[PDB]
Structures are given as C-alpha cells and as structure tokens.
Amino acid sequence: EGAVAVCVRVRPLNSREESLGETAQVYWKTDNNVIYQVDGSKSFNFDRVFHGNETTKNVYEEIAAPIIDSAIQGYNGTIFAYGQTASGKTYTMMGSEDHLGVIPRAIHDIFQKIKKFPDREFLLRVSYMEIYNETITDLLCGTQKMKPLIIREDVNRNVYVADLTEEVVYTSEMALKWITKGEKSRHYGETKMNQRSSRSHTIFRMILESREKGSVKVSHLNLVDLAGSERAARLKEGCNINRSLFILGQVIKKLSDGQVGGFINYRDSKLTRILQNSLGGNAKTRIICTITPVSFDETLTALQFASTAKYMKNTPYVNEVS
Numbered sequence: 484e485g486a487v488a489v490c491v492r493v494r495p496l497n498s499r500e501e502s503l504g505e506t507a508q509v510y511w512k513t514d515n516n517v518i519y520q521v522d523g524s525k526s527f528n529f530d531r532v533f534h535g536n537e538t539t540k541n542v543y544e545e546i547a548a549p550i551i552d553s554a555i556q557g558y559n560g561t562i563f564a565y566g567q568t569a570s571g572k573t574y575t576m577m578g579s580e581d582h583l584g585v586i587p588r589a590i591h592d593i594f595q596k597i598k599k600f601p602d603r604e605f606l607l608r609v610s611y612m613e614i615y616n617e618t619i620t621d622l623l624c625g626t627q628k629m630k631p632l633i634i635r636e637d638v639n640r641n642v643y644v645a646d647l648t649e650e651v652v653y654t655s656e657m658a659l660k661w662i663t664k665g666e667k668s669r670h671y672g673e674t675k676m677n678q679r680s681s682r683s684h685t686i687f688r689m690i691l692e693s694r695e696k697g698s699v700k701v702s703h704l705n706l707v708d709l710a711g712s713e714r715a716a717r718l719k720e721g722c723n724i725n726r727s728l729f730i731l732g733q734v735i736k737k738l739s740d741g742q743v744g745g746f747i748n749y750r751d752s753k754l755t756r757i758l759q760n761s762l763g764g765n766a767k768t769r770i771i772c773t774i775t776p777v778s779f780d781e782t783l784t785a786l787q788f789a790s791t792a793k794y795m796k797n798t799p800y801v802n803e804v805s
C-alpha cells in the first residue's frame with residue numbers, strides 16, 4: 484500500500500562554530516533513519532531521514548517521482564512541506580535555478596514522462612493560490628482577492644475554489660512562466676503587513692487528464708508550501724497561533740487516532756477544507772518535514788506532528804470518468 488509516507492529533511496549547518504559568538508547549540512542528530520536529541524531522551528523513527536548533505540534532487544527522486552508517476556496513472560497525489568520558518572520549506576519546494584525545487588522538477592518530469600505514452604492524449608492545466616488571514620487570493624489574476632470553497636462536484640461532492648484561474652499549458656516553459664508571474668504577483672501583497680510569506684500557505688496544483696487514441700483519467704496534483712509551524716501551537720498569549728496550522732494538526736491527530744465520519748473538523752479552516760481529500764481520503768499523500776538542528780522547541784513540535792502523520796490512512800484509487 485504505502486498510501487501515506489513521511490520523511491524528514493535536516494537543514495545543513497552553515498558552521499559548527501558560529502553565532503552566540505563562538506557557538507549556538509545543536510540539539511538534534513540523525514543516525515540511520517532515526518532522529519534523536521543530543522542530551523535528552525526523545526527520539527523519532529521515520530522510514531527516511533535526509534541529512535544536510537543529501538540534495539533536493541535525491542529528495543525529489545525518492546519521494547516525489549513516484550507520486551508523479553502515480554499522477555500520470557490517474558491517482559490523486561499531494562505533497563506538503565511542513566516546518567519552522569527558515570527550516571528549508573521553500574528551498575525544498577521551489578528552490579533556485581542552481582538547485583530546482585520539487586515543484587519545477589515535477590513539471591519537467593511530468594512533461595518528459597507523458598511522452599513515454601504515445602497511445603494516449605494529454606491535457607494539463609495549472610493553478611496557483613495563496614491562503615493568508617483566512618483569505619484565499621488567486622496568484623494568476625487581475626483583482627477579486629477572496630474566493631469561496633464550493634462543493635458542487637455531485638460526483639462524490641469534491642471541493643474546489645469558486646472558479647480560480649486554471650491555465651492550460653503545453654510546455655514546461657509556459658507552466659514555469661505562470662509560476663514566475665505568481666511568484667512575482669505575491670508582492671502586490673506584502674505591506675498589508677509583511678513577511679506575510681512566513682505567515683501564509685501556497686498551493687500549486689496541476690490537473691492532469693488523459694485518454695487513448697472513452698474513459699478519461701483525471702488526477703489532481705497538489706504541491707504545498709505551508710506557513711511557519713512556530714505559529715502552529717491550554718494556552719494563554721505566549722505565542723501567536725495560525726488557525727489553519729492548528730486545525731491541520733488537530734485533523735491529523737484525530738485521523739491517526741481512529742476518528743472518521745464527522746468527528747473530523749475539516750471545516751474549521753480553509754486549508755483543511757480545500758485539502759480535505761488529501762487527509763485520509765482518495766490520494767497518495769507524502770509529508771516532508773524540514774527541521775533545523777539548532778532549534779529545540781520548534782523542531783520538537785514539527786517532529787511530533789510529522790510522527791503523528793505516519794499513522795494516517797488514505798484509500799487511493801485510479802480516477803476514470805465515463
């Protein structure tokens with residue numbers, strides 16, 4: 484099966500002598516596929532832990548590529564980047580020209596792999612949205628900022644954002660051109676109140692469709708870069724909670740504990756309503772939890788959340804429509 488898999492990626496150290504003069508502290512270490520704390524008794528087991536030396540390419544090839552292949556076969560696939568601000572989420576998901584992230588790699592990979600299937604026909608379209616302060620803005624637009632999450636897909640009642648721009652692309656060059664714009668149009672935002680980046684979620688989605696030479700395979704591939712988890716989580720004001728991150732973890736815990744039907748509060752947040760099907764539904768989900776050794780509380784929180792997600796159960800299948 485392996486419908487749900489979790490891994491951890493550790494941000495490399497720019498040192499071992501540095502900041503707090505002659506040193507800050509390293510609270511975590513990873514050996515084989517376990518991550519334990521320096522001087523403490525907490526340890527965590529994951530079926531894969533990438534160390535500071537391993538490259539985004541390797542993370543992509545081991546984790547993401549199988550999801551892409553599955554997407555091409557008609558399976559819904561979702562991938563999240565979760566972790567503290569500055570732990571490597573965007574580096575892993577978007578990256579640079581020197582070190583392409585998972586999103587651009589997936590695009591290049593998809594266009595190269597559909598060619599290995601001449602008998603069938605391919606239809607691809609992309610979307611790019613941002614979720615901030617409960618409000619959903621379209622990143623390939625002209626100005627209706629806030630859209631609603633409707634349900635009218637009476638074919639299992641699938642969720643969707645009230646007609647958000649969906650652009651048809653034939654080349655990876657065009658796909659990436661939309662990303663670039665979306666990235667840019669992220670700052671005609673910024674000074675509504677900034678570093679809004681570390682406080683918002685972004686979802687890049689690609690809908691794939693295919694047929695031979697009567698039934699059409701249809702799959703949704705969501706690629707998620709979440710908000711900083713330092714604001715994820717009994718308490719008074721001693722931090723600053725992000726509603727979505729909190730509801731995300733709350734929904735994950737319940738699923739891992741055995742709850743279903745309606746004991747799962749997907750509706751208490753936009754994030755969890757939108758990505759509802761990815762949390763215990765009809766998709767292959769993977770979570771990449773980025774961590775930084777020099778952090779203790781934040782790393783601990785993310786590890787607990789990553790650990791809990793290992794036990795989530797999804798039931799994926801091919802989606803062919805008559």
Ligand SMILES: Nc1ncnc2c1ncn2[C@@H]1O[C@H](COP(=O)(O)OP(=O)(O)O)[C@@H](O)[C@H]1O
Binds near residue numbers: 494566
């Ligand atoms: N695995 C890595 N290898 C080299 N540099 C990294 C790695 N992960 C993160 N960085 C660098 O660390 C800094 C933190 O980046 P970032 O991805 O923006 O954090 P986050 O998106 O989670 O808030 C960036 O300058 C980034 O290029």
Ligand SMILES: O=S(=O)(O)CCN1CCN(CCS(=O)(=O)O)CC1
Binds near residue numbers: 616618726728
């Ligand atoms: O700031 S964050 O966007 O991260 C999360 C806050 N936001 C509050 C409003 N709800 C949805 C209500 S409903 O639309 O389902 O009625 C989603 C989450």
Ligand SMILES: [Mg+2]
Binds near residue numbers: 680
């Ligand atoms: Mg970021």
